[PDB]
Symmetry: D2
Subunit: 253 residues, 4 copies
């Protein structure tokens, strides 16, 4: 099943889409700057692009840590991104009451992995009618993602993306099961599956790692990737696109 | 560090406290009947007891499964349990706004494991000044519980209980690391550590399992045991179960720490 | 199923048996010294005891590391231990040809965990007719221990002890699943299950840890405890450790099963 | 570091080598038949190929499962395979004493994973001077493979291949950590790394589609080879896809500074 996000076609047999941006929104200017870099790089390589940021850092290291610009100002910044660059955007939501106002602006809304079993949040997200990115919890098996999907379907929204972000491996470590992508396609109706390489590595030189992991996941035939930014983003994306184009050219077996 | 919960002393070197009751508050009469059974059995054996239930079960298996009676009616039911039996009660909160009204009635408030890194909820719970039970996420190592504790301390609340629920072990399966209890005691200032045996097992006759797991954990010297029954351990086997737990706890607690 | 080892009855509803001694045999005199300490401690506490050591470290990280006295000298030492103290002994075997000569002297022969899939070794061990201790591999689930048991049964030896030593948990770390003991009892015909607390900890002060873990495992009702000291727990803490283990085992074993 | 195995160059920057064959040797005729099928498919695509079989397999699932024809007849079969097809061969050894006579014939000798810490076997294998395939245990972290490598080095042999097979993931299941390949390369001197996809999967259109995804994922990380444990057109279709990816990957320089 493909999903149309404005003029972008997201699907497991379509050219991969890049989801990327910044961790937390800090100001309009630094956001536009970062977005412009991703736009410039993705445009010249011919890769569809969706800009990602959080308006709120929900898990702060301190009760006094900077939390980001917050919802009202964050939505202003997202509106400016869309106007300046004409691309879709994606953000995460953490409370049911945030879903409707966020969805008025953001093309894709994201269900954080730790909250993926929170029924009130699922229902509120579904009711927006927006495209939803479902982050797979670190402790959920790939074959149980279908139970989340079933909830969203019961709540009336089928525009769902499934997003791998690794599985708990002992204490304080993650592993990515490359067979999970296939299990999720098979059991969830071939909804688009994307790979959050950044969060999959959070516990693991490091640029080489991200590239190896991204290549491995994209070899399994996926709708898209998350990655964070001398020209390392372009060097990564060149290689990713080469592999994606090759894989997408082979008939499915 | 011990914590006083009304007339109960909760601590890792005190007689274990039973936290038990039901999954979701579904009605007043049935809640009182269940609680009366736990009361009778725990009074008979001399075990301190705190009644547990959810008023809003936020992580149901279907979106239209009953969430429970909700905040206002749930708090009334809790008030009635406290008035009838004179025991403390414990319930979970999911949203910052619920923290004050729940804390006014409930003697312990619970931070759900999945929400345990949500800073807004941690702060709102801390600020009530109530005793707090912190559920350990399945994906968090026991040496990182101190980071949740630190956030409560920064927010001004040190009346904290740490609750083991198991750790992710491959797919859809939990293991309880018996060494985690000690890691938590050592890194978190010997706050009370309790064991949620019910949620530790839900990924796994079954009564025999709960008993083996409960005994093992209590052998490591814990402040309490957290469980659910169904009118989950069968409610009528409660006395036999608790006899065995009390036996072990009394033996362990009677010996000095080595 | 109980197993008689000379005058010792080993079984999951019998008083626990201590399997203890040293990592590797280095000399007769140090071996007799260490064994004498274990003998006097266990005799006074009334705990059945089997002396353990390896005659060869087959798996050291250097090709030049000390490996121990070796088979010929090692069997001479075990003969002297038995003659001096009148106790059974246990050692591991790593090659099929060692099984018959080892079994002539050693009451219990041990299958190293890494070698548990080696059919040639299983057959050679089984054919001795000796009691066998099966070290549970770190990657084998407790419901699959029956596969190793099956092989020994097919080879005509049912005198088997199942020895827990932890399960792989991410990289370079082990966890002990307290529910795994029950699974093994249920699926392997209630053969004696024992717990190797030492090896279960080698990826993880240490004294308090070993005690907590040992108490936890024994709370599940086990035939025995397997451990190492060095003159591994310090040898002089042995008595205080065993006092606590015995207190808990006595309590558990006094409670009717169910 | 590359390793020359007759006319094959095995290395993490070289065209991938296929390792495959039959589980246990039963007879010369049956062996030649199966080898000829792998030879035909691999020659059609131009993929370097090493035939694998056990002569005495000590870790079968039943104690009376056939272990193979044994050393003397097994080595006669391998001699004939090498002579008929002009390819290298690989076999596992578990007995220190068998290392020498096996190495007279078998180009690569394989260290079973469960035996990988057994010092006497490691030394005996090392002393042959042959290429050695080290099977990575399910319970060993990739940063600890260097300790096995070190024991081989001490015993005088550096012609080592590292074979990934997956890692223990809770009970029963194995997961392949795609980052482990890189950790092995970095810590073990860029020795050739090969991927045993089949083992990696035994615990999990059905199995063929899985094996294909998993093999592609591993080969995307830049590997010296692919290793299969025990349809003519199905192996061909599978290898076409692996070769495509490998050729793409291997043609691009390793990422800059
Ligand atoms: Cl539903
Ligand atoms: Cl709860
Ligand atoms: Cl959790
Ligand atoms: Cl041992
Ligand atoms: Cl292995």
């Amino acid at each position: 099943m493909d999903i149309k996000i404005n003029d972008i076609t997201l699907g497991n047999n379509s050219p991969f889409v890049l989801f990327g941006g910044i961790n937390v929104l800090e100001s309009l200017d630094s956001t536009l700057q970062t977005c412009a870099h991703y736009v410039e790089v993705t445009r010249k390589l011919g890769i569809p692009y969706i800009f990602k940021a959080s308006f709120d850092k929900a898990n702060r290291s301190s009760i006094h840590s900077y939390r980001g610009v917050g919802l009202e100002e964050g939505l202003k910044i997202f509106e400016k991104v869309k106007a300046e660059f004409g691309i879709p955007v994606i953000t995460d939501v953490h409370e049911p009451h945030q879903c409707q106002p966020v969805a008025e602006v953001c093309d894709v809304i994201q269900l954080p992995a730790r909250l993926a079993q929170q029924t009130d949040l699922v229902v509120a997200m579904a009711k927006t009618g927006n495209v939803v990115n479902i982050k797979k919890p670190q402790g959920l098996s790939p074959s149980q993602m279908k139970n989340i999907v079933e909830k969203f379907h019961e709540a009336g929204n089928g525009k769902l993306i499934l997003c791998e972000r690794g599985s708990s491996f002992g204490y304080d470590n993650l592993v990515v099961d490359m067979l999970g992508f296939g299990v999720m396609k098979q059991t969830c109706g071939n909804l688009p599956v994307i790979f959050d390489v950044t969060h999959s590595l959070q516990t693991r030189g490091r640029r080489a790692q991200a590239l190896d992991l991204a290549l491995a996941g994209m070899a399994t035939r996926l709708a898209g990737l998350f990655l964070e930014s001398l020209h390392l983003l372009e060097d990564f994306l060149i290689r990713i696109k080469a592999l994606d184009d090759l894989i997408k050219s082979q008939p499915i077996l």
